[PDB]
Amino acid sequence: SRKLILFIVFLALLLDNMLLTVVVPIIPSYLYSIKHENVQVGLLFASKATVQLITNPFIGLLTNRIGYPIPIFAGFCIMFVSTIMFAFSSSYAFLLIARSLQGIGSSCSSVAGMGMLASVYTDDEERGNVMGIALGGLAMGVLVGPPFGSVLYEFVGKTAPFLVLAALVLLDGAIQLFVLQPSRVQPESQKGTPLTTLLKDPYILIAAGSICFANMGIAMLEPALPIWMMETMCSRKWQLGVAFLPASISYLIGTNIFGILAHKMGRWLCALLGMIIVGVSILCIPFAKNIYGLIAPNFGVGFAIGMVDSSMMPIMGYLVDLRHVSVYGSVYAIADVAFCMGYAIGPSAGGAIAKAIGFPWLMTIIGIIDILFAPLCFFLRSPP
Numbered sequence: 001s002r003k004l005i006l007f008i009v010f011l012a013l014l015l016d017n018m019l020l021t022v023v024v025p026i027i028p029s030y031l032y033s034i035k036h037e038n039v040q041v042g043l044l045f046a047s048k049a050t051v052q053l054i055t056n057p058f059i060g061l062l063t064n065r066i067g068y069p070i071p072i073f074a075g076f077c078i079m080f081v082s083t084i085m086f087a088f089s090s091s092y093a094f095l096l097i098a099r100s101l102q103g104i105g106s107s108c109s110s111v112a113g114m115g116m117l118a119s120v121y122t123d124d125e126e127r128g129n130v131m132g133i134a135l136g137g138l139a140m141g142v143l144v145g146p147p148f149g150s151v152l153y154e155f156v157g158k159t160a161p162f163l164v165l166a167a168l169v170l171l172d173g174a175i176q177l178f179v180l181q182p183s184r185v186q187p188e189s190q191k192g193t194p195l196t197t198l199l200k201d202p203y204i205l206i207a208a209g210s211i212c213f214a215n216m217g218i219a220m221l222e223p224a225l226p227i228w229m230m231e232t233m234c235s236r237k238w239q240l241g242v243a244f245l246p247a248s249i250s251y252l253i254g255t256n257i258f259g260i261l262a263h264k265m266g267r268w269l270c271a272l273l274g275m276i277i278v279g280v281s282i283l284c285i286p287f288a289k290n291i292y293g294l295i296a297p298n299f300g301v302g303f304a305i306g307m308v309d310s311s312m313m314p315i316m317g318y319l320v321d322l323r324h325v326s327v328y329g330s331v332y333a334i335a336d337v338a339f340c341m342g343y344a345i346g347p348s349a350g351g352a353i354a355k356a357i358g359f360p361w362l363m364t365i366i367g368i369i370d371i372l373f374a375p376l377c378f379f380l381r382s383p384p
């Protein structure tokens with residue numbers, strides 16, 4: 001019964017994304033009051049991604065030395081401490097510390113869980129099938145985070161969503177202790193194909209670049225779209241809120257269906273078509289005149305990014321087996337670094353560009369870049 005390991009990675013990713021999305025509404029409002037009674041706010045937002053990017057390679061190396069369960073449980077402990085600090089700390093410095101620890105725990109959870117899922121699901125088809133579910137864990141977390149945080153903030157109080165998240169994290173830790181049992185440190189058999197050799201690989205680089213650009217598109221789109229909506233359409237707050245909902249719904253459906261549909265169609269073809277579709281949707285976003293015009297391109301963006309992720313993570317695992325030794329911590333650290341590359345410089349660079357040139361020009365540039373990179377996914381196809 002290795003399904004319990006899938007549940008642990010699903011719960012870990014889901015709770016991580018719940019915390020990440022509950023935090024985004026609550027933190028600016030709380031700060032916009034203590035200061036009374038641009039640089040630092042962006043630093044607080046990007047600290048999680050920056051620290052996760054920094055500590056991904058170290059966790060990738062550590063998983064080879066001490067196995068996966070100890071990093072997974074450590075990621076749990078760090079996440080629980082970060083949740084408690086979010087609950088009870090009300091200073092900006094402590095908020096930054098909590099964000100940095102959340103990033104460290106996110107790195108541990110993501111890298112170790114993806115490596116463990118790759119190692120226990122050695123089959124090519126089942127690897128993608130379960131990684132679709134694991135990736136849909138993040139989509140479910142993103143979907144059910146903001147409403148959960150909002151209702152628990154409005155009805156009970158500020159610390160209630162964080163306390164409930166901490167209780168759910170404690171239950172996740174109890175089941176982790178029951179199934180993983182990190183009683184002792186165990187090493188893996190062989191070495192790990194040092195990162196210097198993995199990054200020289202053109203195919204691993206192509207997969208990481210496709211993931212990075214597909215995620216950077218949405219990472220620049222998500223914070224820079226509401227500003228342009230207020231500039232042009234003068235939409236209401238709730239319209240600014242439900243505009244990106246189709247992207248999340250479509251990402252969930254696309255991930256959960258293409259985790260299985262990518263093997264029969266071809267993972268390279270799925271990534272190529274995903275890049276083309278996300279580029280086309282990003283190009284067509286600026287032409288929408290109202291929310292009803294933005295309903296479909298956001299769906300396309302989310303669907304295509306789901307295809308890209310669900311086809312490219314199993315490509316990373318397959319490439320490490322095909323050309324290197326079968327150790328996955330380092331390669332999935334590479335993939336996580338590719339994700340946080342978009343997640344870190346996404347908002348700031350996107351805003352800077354949208355200030356220098358118009359928002360439609362930024363969207364056009366992102367779309368043409370994605371479409372131009374799409375042919376590069378052809379080289380990922382198997383020789384036969």
Ligand SMILES: NCCc1c[nH]cn1
Binds near residue numbers: 215305
């Ligand atoms: N690691 C986050 C993957 C993702 C979800 N949505 C967009 N990208």
